Amino acid sequence: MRVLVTGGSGYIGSHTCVQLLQNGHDVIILDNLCNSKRSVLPVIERLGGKHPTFVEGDIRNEALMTEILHDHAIDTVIHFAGLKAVGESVQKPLEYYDNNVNGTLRLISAMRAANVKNFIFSSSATVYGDNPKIPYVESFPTGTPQSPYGKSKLMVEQILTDLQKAQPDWSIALLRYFNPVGAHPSGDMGEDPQGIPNNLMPYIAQVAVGRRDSLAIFGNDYPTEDGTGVRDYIHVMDLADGHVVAMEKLANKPGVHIYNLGAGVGNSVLDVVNAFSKACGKPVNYHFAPRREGDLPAYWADASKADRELNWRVTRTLDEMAQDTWHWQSRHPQGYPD
Amino acid sequence: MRVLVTGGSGYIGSHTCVQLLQNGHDVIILDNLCNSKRSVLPVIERLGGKHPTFVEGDIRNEALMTEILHDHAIDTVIHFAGLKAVGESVQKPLEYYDNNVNGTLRLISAMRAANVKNFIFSSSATVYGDNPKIPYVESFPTGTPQSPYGKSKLMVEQILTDLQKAQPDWSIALLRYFNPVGAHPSGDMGEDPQGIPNNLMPYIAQVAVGRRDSLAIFGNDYPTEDGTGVRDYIHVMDLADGHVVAMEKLANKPGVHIYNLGAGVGNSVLDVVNAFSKACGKPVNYHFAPRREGDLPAYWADASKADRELNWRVTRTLDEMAQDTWHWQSRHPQGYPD
Numbered sequence: 001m002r003v004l005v006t007g008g009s010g011y012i013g014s015h016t017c018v019q020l021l022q023n024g025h026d027v028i029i030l031d032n033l034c035n036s037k038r039s040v041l042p043v044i045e046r047l048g049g050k051h052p053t054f055v056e057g058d059i060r061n062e063a064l065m066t067e068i069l070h071d072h073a074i075d076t077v078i079h080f081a082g083l084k085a086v087g088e089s090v091q092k093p094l095e096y097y098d099n100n101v102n103g104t105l106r107l108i109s110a111m112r113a114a115n116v117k118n119f120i121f122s123s124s125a126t127v128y129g130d131n132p133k134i135p136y137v138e139s140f141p142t143g144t145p146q147s148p149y150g151k152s153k154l155m156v157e158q159i160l161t162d163l164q165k166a167q168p169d170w171s172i173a174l175l176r177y178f179n180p181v182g183a184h185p186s187g188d189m190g191e192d193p194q195g196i197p198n199n200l201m202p203y204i205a206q207v208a209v210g211r212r213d214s215l216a217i218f219g220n221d222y223p224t225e226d227g228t229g230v231r232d233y234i235h236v237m238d239l240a241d242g243h244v245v246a247m248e249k250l251a252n253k254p255g256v257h258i259y260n261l262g263a264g265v266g267n268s269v270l271d272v273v274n275a276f277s278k279a280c281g282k283p284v285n286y287h288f289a290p291r292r293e294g295d296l297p298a299y300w301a302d303a304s305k306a307d308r309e310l311n312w313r314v315t316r317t318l319d320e321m322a323q324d325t326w327h328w329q330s331r332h333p334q335g336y337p338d
Numbered sequence: 339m340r341v342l343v344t345g346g347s348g349y350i351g352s353h354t355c356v357q358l359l360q361n362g363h364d365v366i367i368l369d370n371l372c373n374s375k376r377s378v379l380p381v382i383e384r385l386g387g388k389h390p391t392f393v394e395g396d397i398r399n400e401a402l403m404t405e406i407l408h409d410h411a412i413d414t415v416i417h418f419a420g421l422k423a424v425g426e427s428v429q430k431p432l433e434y435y436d437n438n439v440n441g442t443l444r445l446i447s448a449m450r451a452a453n454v455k456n457f458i459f460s461s462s463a464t465v466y467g468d469n470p471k472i473p474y475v476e477s478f479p480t481g482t483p484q485s486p487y488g489k490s491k492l493m494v495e496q497i498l499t500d501l502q503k504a505q506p507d508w509s510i511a512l513l514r515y516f517n518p519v520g521a522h523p524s525g526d527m528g529e530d531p532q533g534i535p536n537n538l539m540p541y542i543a544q545v546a547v548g549r550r551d552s553l554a555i556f557g558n559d560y561p562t563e564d565g566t567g568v569r570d571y572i573h574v575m576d577l578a579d580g581h582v583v584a585m586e587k588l589a590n591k592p593g594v595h596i597y598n599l600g601a602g603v604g605n606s607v608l609d610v611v612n613a614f615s616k617a618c619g620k621p622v623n624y625h626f627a628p629r630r631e632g633d634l635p636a637y638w639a640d641a642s643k644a645d646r647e648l649n650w651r652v653t654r655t656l657d658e659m660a661q662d663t664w665h666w667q668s669r670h671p672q673g674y675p676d
């Protein structure tokens with residue numbers, strides 16, 4: 001199929017592009033480079049084994065999106081583009097609503113204009129809000145996300161749902177992500193955050209590579225087995241594969257298809273730390289710090305629906321997640337070149 | 339004060355502009371004329387007793403909004419501009435999210451750019467969602483609106499709330515409207531809907547003027563005293579006054595100030611019909627039809643907060659609402675001239 005991958009040069013999108021190309025799809029990447037570099041492009045092509053077309057541009061530019069869509073006879077769109085720093089979202093709400101809410105709105109309006117009706121959206125477990133029932137199941141009513149970031153995702157899910165009701169020929173997949181970690185097994189493609197990493201894995205990795213002193217573990221008094229927060233970690237390669245399957249199986253199948261994409265099990269902060277120390281060959285330095293504002297103690301996905309309906313399930317392990325991350329971090333300590 | 343009134347040429351905004359001018363404020367009206375006519379302008383000036391500046395333009399145009407704001411040294415913004423046909427919103431969701439969500443986002447981003455930090459937003463009782471507890475109180479957590487229109491309003495309230503948290507010097511009033519009816523007592527300014535009116539009052543008025551056959555009363559089997567739906571009707575003049583007070587009293591008072599603006603009591607469809615028959619001097623023709631999709635049986639506002647904090651309360655009656663409406667309808671059967 002002809003697929004437009006917005007945010008295609010970023011973390012999850014890069015890996016997704018590789019798997020898409022491996023599957024022989026024609027890929028057009030759209031990215032504004034606010035959080036990624038052109039240097040990942042040749043890596044995508046090499047690992048994907050096929051050239052993906054790249055367009056530098058912004059999802060907010062409806063006219064350009066329309067042009068791209070038509071120009072490339074796109075059949076389906078995978079939408080990864082947006083902002084995702086939770087804390088920053090609290091500080092700069094407008095930029096989040098603009099990039100995420102308006103950004104998606106501009107893109108789907110362009111789709112309408114171009115007659116494209118298959119969409120895959122990068123959603124989030126934040127949409128469940130403060131749900132005491134774990135694991136989280138797609139059948140659960142959404143809650144109230146605590147940050148502007150979380151809210152922006154839930155708002156987009158609602159807008160897409162309304163759009164589908166109004167244009168019932170559309171196929172829209174709402175893929176709810178949990179905690180994506182890992183890197184392509186080659187060690188040549190991975191997460192390349194700028195500045196202080198907000199997520200656990202990359203932070204640990206930077207401590208391990210020697211850039212940082214100690215990992216601050218946010219809270220050690222939660223009602224979990226070891227007192228640290230528990231999450232559902234998923235290897236970016238499994239996530240990428242889930243996207244290829246969803247795209248292939250849902251294209252032209254009218255409806256709003258919601259799926260949690262996660263491993264279906266929880267791991268604590270210590271479990272992750274331990275796996276990484278094991279991977280890197282040295283004990284990762286860490287200390288206990290106060291709980292992080294707005295954090296939930298524990299949650300993980302219920303991934304039965306994706307297994308059942310798409311025949312998709314994770315295959316990589318937590319150790320692999322840590323190992324692949326360390327491999328990338330260590331092979332490319334400065335990330336992608338400028 | 340110097341106030342920018344978006345949607346100023348529409349129903350509620352026109353009346354608000356009149357009262358603002360009467361209070362000696364300098365008013366700048368911004369409207370795209372998608373649901374109003376330039377012919378209301380001279381009426382606003384005449385009834386307001388002072389000239390309001392008018393700019394034809396769109397809230398979505400951030401650059402223009404910014405320019406206006408600066409050019410006119412605006413101190414505060416009253417935001418009435420947006421789309422509000424509920425049924426159409428279900429059919430054309432994108433236009434609603436764009437005009438309402440993105441439209442407000444563009445406007446407040448322009449405000450940021452221009453250093454304007456006082457805002458008044460036209461909110462809605464739809465934000466309470468399907469709340470069984472009536473009357474509705476500001477202290478109630480919001481619910482889930484059933485239409486794209488309802489959702490767009492709640493999304494804006496959330497975005498504004500986040501904005502205020504991030505720029506705590508801002509003063510933002512979330513004015514939740516219930517069922518605005520009536521017309522300026524002069525009979526020369528009123529609601530001028532195009533095509534079939536969606537709301538009860540105007541529909542009744544068109545039946546009365548002879549344009550329509552019979553009012554279809556949506557449902558007669560609700561758990562209400564007479565079996566018809568019950569709502570909180572508020573005279574547009576009281577609503578207008580509430581806006582002047584809110585603007586004057588909340589300017590430069592940091593926070594998110596939420597107030598329901600309603601009469602605080604409920605009236606059924608039959609009560610409204612009866613009041614109008616009385617006003618127009620002839621029995622209004624009507625029949626019972628099936629319930630309207632998504633309608634709630636009964637709800638009204640709890641307006642104690644506005645009374646207490648702003649010393650504001652309604653003063654016009656249901657009869658006045660009907661009378662003023664008939665007066666306008668009858669004096670100007672073709673509405674505002676083209």
Ligand SMILES: NC(=O)c1ccc[n+]([C@@H]2O[C@H](COP(=O)([O-])OP(=O)(O)OC[C@H]3O[C@@H](n4cnc5c(N)ncnc54)[C@H](O)[C@@H]3O)[C@@H](O)[C@H]2O)c1
Pocket residue numbers: 006007008009010011012013030031032033034035036057058059060079080081082083084099103122123124125126177178179180
């Ligand atoms: N739990 C969660 O909510 C969860 C977990 C991770 C990622 N996600 C979502 O998955 C998506 C991909 O995440 P990621 O980790 O790859 O992040 P990322 O920052 O690496 O990728 C996003 C890409 O979008 C691009 N971009 C940003 N705004 C843009 C715009 N306006 N126009 C064009 N390009 C733009 C960036 O330059 C970047 O290459 C995002 O939507 C993210 O919010 C959600």
Ligand SMILES: NC(=O)c1ccc[n+]([C@@H]2O[C@H](COP(=O)([O-])OP(=O)(O)OC[C@H]3O[C@@H](n4cnc5c(N)ncnc54)[C@H](O)[C@@H]3O)[C@@H](O)[C@H]2O)c1
Pocket residue numbers: 344345346347348349350351368369370371372373374395396397398417418419420421422437441460461462463464515516517518
């Ligand atoms: N229960 C409720 O939710 C409730 C009741 C009535 C009205 N309201 C809200 O109050 C406001 C005023 O309502 P009204 O009855 O006066 O409606 P209205 O249609 O008469 O007024 C809206 C005005 O906004 C203008 N407009 C629309 N989109 C615009 C845009 N993108 N840029 C510039 N101008 C634009 C229209 O031309 C019109 O003059 C609206 O926001 C409406 O949704 C809410």
Ligand SMILES: O=c1ccn([C@@H]2O[C@H](COP(=O)(O)OP(=O)(O)O)[C@@H](O)[C@H]2O)c(=O)[nH]1
Pocket residue numbers: 178179198199200201203215216217218219228229230231269292295
């Ligand atoms: O420097 C860090 C980053 C994260 N965490 C914890 O690691 C888990 C995952 O955090 P992350 O921010 O990566 O993603 P989230 O689960 O919030 O989407 C949570 O329990 C966080 O409290 C931590 O202790 N230190």
Ligand SMILES: O=c1ccn([C@@H]2O[C@H](COP(=O)(O)OP(=O)(O)O)[C@@H](O)[C@H]2O)c(=O)[nH]1
Pocket residue numbers: 516517536537538539541553554555556557566567568569607630633
């Ligand atoms: O042609 C109409 C319009 C409205 N209504 C009823 O009148 C009340 C107010 O309807 P409206 O659409 O004006 O506003 P809402 O309360 O939905 O905001 C509700 O009980 C509607 O079911 C009716 O019976 N016939």
Ligand code: NA
Pocket residue numbers: 165166167428429
């Ligand atoms: Na429809």
Ligand code: NA
Pocket residue numbers: 334335336337
């Ligand atoms: Na670098």
Ligand code: NA
Pocket residue numbers: 090091503504505
């Ligand atoms: Na802040």
Ligand code: NA
Pocket residue numbers: 672673674675
């Ligand atoms: Na007319």
